[PDB]
Design a protein around this nucleic acid. Sequence first.
DNA 1: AAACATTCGTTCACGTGAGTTCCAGTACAAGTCTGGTC
DNA 2: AGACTTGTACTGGAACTCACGTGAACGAATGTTT
Lengths: 24, 102, 244
Amino acid sequence: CPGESLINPGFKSKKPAGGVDFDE
Amino acid sequence: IFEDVEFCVMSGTDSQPKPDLENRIAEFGGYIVQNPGPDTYCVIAGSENIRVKNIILSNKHDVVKPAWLLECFKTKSFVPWQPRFMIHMCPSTKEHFAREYD
Amino acid sequence: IHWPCRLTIGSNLSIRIAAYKSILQERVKKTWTVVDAKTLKKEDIQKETVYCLNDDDETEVLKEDIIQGFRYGSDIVPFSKVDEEQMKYKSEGKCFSVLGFCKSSQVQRRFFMGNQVLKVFAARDDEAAAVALSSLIHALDDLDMVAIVRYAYDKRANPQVGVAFPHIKHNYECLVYVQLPFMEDLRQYMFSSLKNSKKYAPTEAQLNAVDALIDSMSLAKKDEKTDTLEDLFPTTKIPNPRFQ
DNA sequence: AAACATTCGTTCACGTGAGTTCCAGTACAAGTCTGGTC
DNA sequence: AGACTTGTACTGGAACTCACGTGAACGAATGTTT
């Protein structure tokens, strides 16, 4: 399934934390 | 030669890996304690790894390079400490050395 | 007890604020004391713990001859308490900083965490702080926004990321702070869909009957369809039966 | 009259016991296999 | 007859979760001393 993590199958791959990024 | 003295070795040289050193010291009747404690007489560390750093920052017991140990096996006698082997000295024993050293 | 702090937006703006604990789980003030069955005296019983090795001889190890450690996979790595304190994450306590502002729609109620809700008012006997807090609250309410902020009770308290949102009433207005989850606190579970399931599709009669059931069991009544609703069964005013 | 120390209700963190769900291991029934003999 | 394979249920243990209890720190109020 798209987005599946390659380390732990059956768990959604978590996007890296980006903290706060102010918009334009 | 070593009799009921607490040593905690946490690092070994490439030529002499930690476990080997442990065995060697056991052969001379030294009490191996895997971690230093109030009764520990000197911790040994050939390589200043993170553990050793922590230990020295605790300023509790003196760190000694393995050098000293090897010489004890090359003369079959207990040699007094000199500042050629230590790395860090605990607050009390530092005084003991200072009177006779710079 | 009031908690004084400073709401800071950047390094130049600071508003003196006081926080109170609005809603929390209440527990019994007095605990049960174990007493000897016969004499019925506390001082006749003493609880203590001992540690013994896993060897066959069952050697005795004193409390000064043990250390703390953790598990790293299939092995165990010693980690003393002094070393942990030295390596511990150190932060500056008593911080109430506005990390940012975000739309209320992006902060869902189901993600609220913690065991407390904080009500933040302006500092006592402070007109400038009250004016600043009122301005911030009114701006947030007008723009339909909330403040993602960092909260720390004291030096030895773990920092938290939470959401503060306005709460304006005819009498008083104040900020309401509730903790928010971290990346580690989210569980990613997948559940089968119900609408698309062929064998779990209710029929028209079942839906009609459920609608009738919901209509009959209404716990709120309209006031003659005139002004507003009225609560038949308010659960907030019911005393906790445990204490009773 | 003002400053400093002590105390008390409050708060947070950490540790220990009891309930629930999921999984490894064990004793035994039965199926299956096999050897020797006339 | 004996021995190995498959299955079968059952027991106990590991891990997760919650509640309850203990320890330590602390801000505000009050009392004492100068």
